[PDB]
Design a protein around this ligand. Structure first.
Ligand SMILES: *C/C=C1/C(=C/c2[nH]c(/C=C3[NH+]=C(/C=C4\NC(=O)C(C=C)=C4C)C(C)=C\3CCC(=O)O)c(CCC(=O)O)c2C)NC(=O)[C@H]1C
Ligand SMILES: *C/C=C1/C(=C/c2[nH]c(/C=C3[NH+]=C(/C=C4\NC(=O)C(C=C)=C4C)C(C)=C\3CCC(=O)O)c(CCC(=O)O)c2C)NC(=O)[C@H]1C
Lengths: 313, 315
């Protein structure tokens, strides 16, 4: 099963119970964005991140009464149609708001049962993606495909190190390719145990395909209330990219000397084949539109991995 | 019966009938569609060899001036990028794309690929979260039918085409419209079935490698290359990888007979075989700009993946 989260007086995680930490219900988010939850029917704002006032420019109480209808007039009917009751928690809808306080915000919404989860992040506003797609397709074998993928991602993102991590049948890991800035250690060829990406983590990475930590020293921002009014239970955040990253897993990025990280899951035959793993030495908020490019690349790599593995077997 | 290609018309080959369907060399027509321009150049020196006859009017230069310069001089910023992206021995399927600001012609899209020692350069005029939203909707479709319907409707919304069908090949290469989105008033093709020779086998092989072709105007005359043969080889210039390459007159006649002014399709490729086709119709001529066509190319790949996934959920 899982332990209760901390804020419901559950045990503090260790290296003894690595498999039961509820990474999907931390009750908090990373501070480079803001999150609201809301009722599926009424559009009634039920929870907000204590930092919402910053991004939205709204007097705190104003929000926690109001309706999405009021708050987002153009958007609220689109949401209603895009995310019908009963849809999967994996389905997401995005829009760009030209919002008074903040030039442009990206809005990302998904639905978990009766709750809409809304994420707001700063945003903005060429051929590198098309060029990359053809490059991946003409790679002659899996090894070269891995090399092209890591190089392409590094060029698109500027990340200090981009690896292709591959899981063995027992969940043992292997960096099989790596693109990195001069003057970093080389993790190419190394392996790591199946514990280092635990079992509920690989389960969530199978369904929600891109997760990231923007600053390994930033404090999480609580949800208020912490419990969903609807249920008097924890809000599932597993499909939110803003959802707080396990302090366990941030402590290990710090011990490595990483200040910003990001992965895209590579899913083949319904299973987690491997990750596109990116490292930055300093804090780094990759904007939403560039993340989208990596999300596309994730799908394309998933296709090409199968194609390429089929021409060996 | 499968038989080798005839020589093209310009090398004294025969004209094409219902008898000799399978034997047109559809890849080497010696000509392009008039809404863009094409140059060929030597892959090592960058000497310009062939050009479409309309090139002066896209590129704003006399032929003899174009042909008298190397790509190093014509494309000083792109020439080194081309050479890195398209190394000798690379496959003909690999494409490099850039946008140019050309004085006389505005923003041009440049698409380049390499066939042996030849570079082929295509120039076309070029011009929010719809793709991301579509990607997730496709993935959440519960079964093959719902996927097919979401895919057709999405493509129609993105493009404005009068008719978008998903066309699926059977094992005998007969096909069948399994989903479609269509303009009000058009008659349905859904569930119809069409004989194998409707898409003959020399073109199904080509659609397994080069995943997007179109006819922008089914009455437009093709524009010859000049000279017609590659001076490197005194042989035909391979245009199977060029979206501009002129479209065969037997195909063009049939689209005309169906009342179509504009066509397009992306291939859906599963396990190395052509599974089907996102076919698009418009009643009037219609040019879809290169950046919009890129969205369809990306959807072609997504759909190939999702078709595998939906079919595996099915035994
Ligand atoms: C006692 C718990 C441990 C633990 C937990 C844990 N790990 C993740 C996710 C990841 N762990 C990774 C480990 C590596 N990072 C590397 O750079 C390398 C190799 C060079 C390895 C083996 C990786 C890559 C991930 C994926 C996430 C990412 O970095 O982008 C989680 C899940 C966190 C979340 O879902 O928010 C958890 C709880 N990992 C351990 O190694 C032990 C100490
Ligand atoms: C003697 C040869 C004949 C022939 C020539 C020919 N046809 C193609 C390609 C296509 N034919 C298609 C037929 C259909 N169009 C539809 O709308 C439907 C159903 C609703 C069918 C069955 C299709 C879809 C294609 C593919 C092209 C596209 O979709 O855009 C070619 C190859 C063209 C080229 O690569 O240059 C040729 C030479 N067509 C015949 O019917 C026979 C008599």
């Amino acid at each position: 099963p899982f332990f209760p989260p901390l804020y419901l007086g559950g045990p503090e995680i260790t290296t003894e119970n690595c498999e039961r930490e509820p990474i999907h219900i931390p009750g908090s988010i990373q501070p480079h964005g803001a999150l609201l939850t809301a009722d599926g029917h009424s559009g009634e704002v039920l929870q907000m991140s204590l930092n919402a006032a910053t991004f939205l420019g709204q007097e705190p109480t104003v929000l926690r009464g109001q309706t999405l209808a009021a708050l987002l007039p153009e958007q609220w009917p689109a949401l209603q149609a895009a995310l019908p009751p009963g849809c999967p928690d994996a389905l997401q809808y995005r829009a760009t708001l030209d919002w008074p306080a903040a030039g442009h915000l990206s809005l990302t919404v998904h639905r978990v049962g009766e709750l809409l989860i809304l994420e707001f992040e700063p945003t903005e506003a060429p051929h590198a993606l098309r060029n990359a797609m053809f490059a991946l397709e003409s790679a002659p074998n899996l090894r070269a495909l891995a090399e092209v993928a890591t190089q392409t991602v590094r060029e698109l993102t500027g990340f200090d190190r981009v690896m292709l991590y591959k899981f063995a049948p027992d969940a043992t890991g292997e960096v099989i390719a790596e693109a990195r800035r001069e003057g970093l250690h080389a993790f190419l060829g190394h392996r790591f145990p199946a514990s280092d990406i635990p079992a509920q983590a690989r389960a969530l990475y199978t369904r929600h395909l891109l997760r990231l930590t923007a600053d390994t020293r930033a404090a999480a921002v609580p949800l208020d209330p912490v419990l969903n009014p609807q249920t008097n239970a924890p809000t599932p955040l597993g499909g939110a990219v803003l959802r707080a990253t396990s302090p366990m897993h941030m402590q290990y990025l710090r011990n490595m000397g990483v200040g910003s990280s990001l992965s895209v899951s590579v899913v083949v035959g319904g299973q987690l084949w491997g990750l596109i793993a990116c490292h930055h030495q300093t804090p780094y908020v990759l904007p939403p539109d560039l993340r989208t490019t990596l999300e596309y690349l994730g799908r394309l790599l998933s296709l090409q991995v199968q194609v390429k593995e089929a021409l060996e077997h």
